[PDB]
Amino acid sequence: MKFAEHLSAHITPEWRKQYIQYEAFKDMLYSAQDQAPSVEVTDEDTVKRYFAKFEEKFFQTCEKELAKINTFYSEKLAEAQRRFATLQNELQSSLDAQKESHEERVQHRNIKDLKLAFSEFYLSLILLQNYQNLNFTGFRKILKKHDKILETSRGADWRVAHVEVAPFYTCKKINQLISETEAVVTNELEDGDRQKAMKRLRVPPLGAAQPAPAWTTFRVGLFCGIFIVLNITLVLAAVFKLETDRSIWPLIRIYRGGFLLIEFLFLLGINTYGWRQAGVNHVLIFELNPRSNLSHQHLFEIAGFLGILWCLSLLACFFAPISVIPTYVYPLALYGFMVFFLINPTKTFYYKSRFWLLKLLFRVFTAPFHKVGFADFWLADQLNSLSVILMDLEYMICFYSLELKWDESKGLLPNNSEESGICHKYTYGVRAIVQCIPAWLRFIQCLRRYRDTKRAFPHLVNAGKYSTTFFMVTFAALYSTHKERGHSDTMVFFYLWIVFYIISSCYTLIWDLKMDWGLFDKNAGENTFLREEIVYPQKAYYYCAIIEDVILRFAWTIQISITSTTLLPHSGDIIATVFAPLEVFRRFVWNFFRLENEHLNNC
Amino acid sequence: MKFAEHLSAHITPEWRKQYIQYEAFKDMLYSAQDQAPSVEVTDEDTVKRYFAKFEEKFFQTCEKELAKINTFYSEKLAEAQRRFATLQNELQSSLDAQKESHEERVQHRNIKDLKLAFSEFYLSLILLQNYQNLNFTGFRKILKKHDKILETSRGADWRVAHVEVAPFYTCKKINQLISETEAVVTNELEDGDRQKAMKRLRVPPLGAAQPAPAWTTFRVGLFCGIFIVLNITLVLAAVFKLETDRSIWPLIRIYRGGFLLIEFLFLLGINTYGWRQAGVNHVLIFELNPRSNLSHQHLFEIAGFLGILWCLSLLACFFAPISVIPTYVYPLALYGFMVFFLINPTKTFYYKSRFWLLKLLFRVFTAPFHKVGFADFWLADQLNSLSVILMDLEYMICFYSLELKWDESKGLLPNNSEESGICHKYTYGVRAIVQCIPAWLRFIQCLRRYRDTKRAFPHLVNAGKYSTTFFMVTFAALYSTHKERGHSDTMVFFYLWIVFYIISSCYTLIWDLKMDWGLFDKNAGENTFLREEIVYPQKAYYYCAIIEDVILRFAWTIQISITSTTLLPHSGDIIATVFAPLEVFRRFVWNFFRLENEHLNNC
Ligand SMILES: O=P(O)(O)O[C@H]1[C@H](OP(=O)(O)O)[C@@H](OP(=O)(O)O)[C@H](OP(=O)(O)O)[C@@H](OP(=O)(O)O)[C@H]1OP(=O)(O)O
Ligand SMILES: O=P(O)(O)O[C@H]1[C@H](OP(=O)(O)O)[C@@H](OP(=O)(O)O)[C@H](OP(=O)(O)O)[C@@H](OP(=O)(O)O)[C@H]1OP(=O)(O)O
């Protein structure tokens, strides 16, 4: 309400402290009004002296904040012109190089980068202009409010004697700067095409939140409703219309991956909504284009659509109304549709989003030959917690290639055959390597980062933490195969195994609480066990995260060990399936604090 | 982009012609720019005289439109001043009467009515201010556009010489007016409470469409999705899970009403959406409070929720999980929930809407005594199209009270008993009166209107129209009972019956095309077979309405005749079911044109 929430919505995520503290002056004026001693206990001289002293303190605070505004604006303007001169020099160099093939491609990439730089400079200039306008509006509003409450005209005199003569308000150099940038872009860059110049230099109202179209919200609601009703009917159909002829392992073992993917997309949508609400400049961190970024609603829509596809495919797998090929087409059809959706080459269905995502995925998969950005290793750590999809895909390809009789029906082939359990076994080695692929990719990425930076800490320690999983999985496999062979010394390999269990968790957990989040700092001060500046209002969120992460790390390591070792022949698959949709929740809660730590400590 | 859509959304409907014809100015300037031939083709003298003559014509047109705007503003200000004087006199009289029981209640209703009058006055003055500001903005906008396209500075000089001195902008009496009204409201009425004074006089941004919350759209989507999935599963369950041993009539004949009502609500939501989009001032016509009106989204939400309840009740009726009572609680429970939803006495679940609708329904059901508004007889005619709900309700009461053995099970009592078919008969004759109730109410309303106005040409004939249903139903009942008795002269009563068929349709259809819509106008002729002015862009809508209404009138009259005559033992309920959900569509298509015609002629 009023200018208060307007300013609060128009806060720049970077310079939040530099803005006028409308709330502070608001509450201190109400504090002035609230005291109000008894009407007849003392002379009106005391009341007027109280009014005068509080007015003097109000003027002192206003002058202090005004001086801070002047200094901040002058400094900002200083680097504004210095950056303008630097970009003008670069533009002149590029133009004179062009005026006088590989050279043409270099000029093309340079001018495109220059256009992007001019775009961000124009955003900076308009941000400064909005800064000045918001400060002026806040000053006029607070002075009017004060003149109203104190029923005096002193606020107007203070404003006219201070504000309209303030250097920040009197300086119009920002307008000449933006006009010169616009003219340069129109003339030198666009060759007189003013329309294209503006179209590239548009600035959508980022300050006014985001005008989400009603159609997107309606579609999200429709998809959510259809998904929940399909889920309910799936539960009822599974409970009632299922008979007993086979233990239904393959169906869950195949659809667990789709369930994990859908849950991950939903949680990432919640994650980005919280990121936007908290004020963390995530778009800058991911070097995304500020013109076009995906809000949470699109992620919710995509998650709902994939959930619909998965649920209908699984329900068709149960019921199987009528066909010629009985049941082993639905999972294949669903996965084919998903993979084709991901690689759609037309300019439809978020073409830029899919292109950028697949480019990032190719970069992260070929990481040993690429640099390290924040969008790269974050996706690598995202994939590190989703080894279950790779496991399920390998199991599905094994089942459909070797075990399943392709030209047959039903799909409950006898388990008494020797070929039953070919990849329910582990001596093939096709389980340890698949599980360790994410760890290997992440570790080699960290090693390349260290080599590029030439700085041992913290990259070597990080590489060790990523490499502990190698020992974990390999020794679990050794124990499993030696138990299969029934050797006398096999039990010995159990002992140190448990040791390497602990040296994993208590290790990585520490890495999760010192460098990833920067908590437990020596300068906690008033906030025991926490950090000085926390964006989220409540510390109970931090407490629940710190109490859940310790359990979830043990859960993840034990679940990956049992998945790759396949002991406990009955309950092993059940424990793996039940523990799978918990590490994803851990990965969801981890991102909040990871980025709120990175945003403050840029580093 | 430009201010085109800005004004097109911000133009007040009832003064749309008075605003700037900015679009015409755009297109004429674009035509002027495009018509210029090549430089080499024509001499520069011809080019310059072209610019000179078109500039002169542009200035002439702008002078004409500004003169019209000044005259309009002067007249508006004069009537605003006279209205202000009148309301000041009324306030003075009220306050001096108050200063010097029934008298207190009269004073209370006077002060509330005066508060409403001041609200309307403040809204009108703010509308005038918005008009003036938009006109000034449009002038400066088109002038700078002309200056940029003609690369001349003549526009600025013309603006400062004409627009700056223009009487509409120079007259600042509007601000003194609003300040005086605000001061009077704060002091005389609110007794110094400025906060309550402005909150009662707050004006939401009606010009900027409507900021619909995203939560409402999400809820609408969720309800629509759940409804469509429940509909599909109900269709499949009815096709497969239902057998045929005792027919399904005693179920559809009770569950038709919920579908009818839900369809009516959905179509009414469509009506209000189209009404808002086309610009027809429907809120003024219904004397609704302009600050609190229901957009289409709320109607869609209510329709979806009722659809969910009805579909769930029907689905539970099919499968019928059994604890004690087999099947005859679901319809009663659903109807009880609906009626309790309508009569909720708390302040939740649309507190104002339900109270207003209940008051209107009571007023229309006490038609012979209370007066006539617009919403009154509009709702009367709206209910005249839904006699099927009353038919189904009385049939439900008849079945549950007499035929149904409530202390039994199943719900498929044999039809071989003598009492069976009594409720399928008409010996009591209740069908005729139940069907003829809406006609009687509408006739009484028209008779009261005629008596009050003492003018027979537009009222007495209106009453005479609604008496044909009486003769139709009575003659149908006579034919049915004489056929049941098998008298020799029975067939004779058929003959005139068919006659009174035609004298119904060809009569009321004419009434639907002359006074209800104002079509076929002799004074017209700009558009063949249409009126002088239309609001919807396409005449094909009028053509399809005029081609469908002729069929629908015959359909409605034959369906009511067959419903109340109890003939065609096999196809009777079938024809009733297939014809019922289309008369509501006829009412839906009728409302649009009825209100666009009532908006202009003002009968
Ligand atoms: O792209 P828009 O948002 O519609 O901007 C239009 C206009 O473009 P159009 O004439 O095609 O409508 C001008 O662009 P050009 O004609 O010069 O190519 C532009 O110019 P300036 O910013 O330099 O004034 C000006 O933008 P703005 O909204 O900031 O005033 C504004 O002009 P019009 O509303 O008069 O058309
Ligand atoms: O919050 P609003 O009801 O929209 O109005 C507030 C304010 O009330 P608050 O004291 O609760 O903040 C003033 O109320 P009064 O003390 O004068 O009764 C009012 O004053 P004016 O309308 O006379 O200016 C002014 O409204 P406006 O937005 O038109 O300036 C605006 O105050 P602020 O926006 O400056 O905080």
Curated annotation (Swiss-Prot), chains A, B:
GO MF terms, alphabetically ordered: efflux transmembrane transporter activity; inositol hexakisphosphate binding; phosphate transmembrane transporter activity; virus receptor activity
Chain positions of site Gating residue for phosphate transport: 556
Reported effect, residue 583 to A: Decreases phosphate efflux
Organism: Homo sapiens
Reported effect, residue 141 to A: Decreases phosphate efflux. Decreases phosphate efflux
Effect of substituting residue 516 to A: Decreases phosphate efflux
Protein name from the UniProt record: Solute carrier family 53 member 1
GO terms under biological process: cellular response to phosphate starvation; intracellular phosphate ion homeostasis; phosphate ion transmembrane transport; phosphate ion transport; response to virus
Annotated stretches, region: Important for inositol polyphosphate binding: 141-148
Protein's job: Inorganic ion transporter that mediates phosphate ion export across plasma membrane. Plays a major role in phosphate homeostasis, preventing intracellular phosphate accumulation and possible calcium phosphate precipitation, ultimately preserving calcium signaling. Binds inositol hexakisphosphate (Ins6P) and similar inositol polyphosphates, such as 5-diphospho-inositol pentakisphosphate (5-InsP7), which are important intracellular signaling molecules involved in regulation of phosphate flux.
Activity regulation statement: Allosterically activated by inositol hexakisphosphate (Ins6P).
Residue span(s) of domain SPX: 2-207
Keyword Nuclease: no
Keywords in alphabetical order: Cell membrane, Disease variant, Membrane, Phosphoprotein, Transmembrane, Transmembrane helix
InterPro entries: EXS_C (IPR004342), SPX_dom (IPR004331)
Effect of substituting residue 431 to A: Decreases phosphate efflux
Residues annotated as domain EXS: 422-603
Disulfide bond entries: none
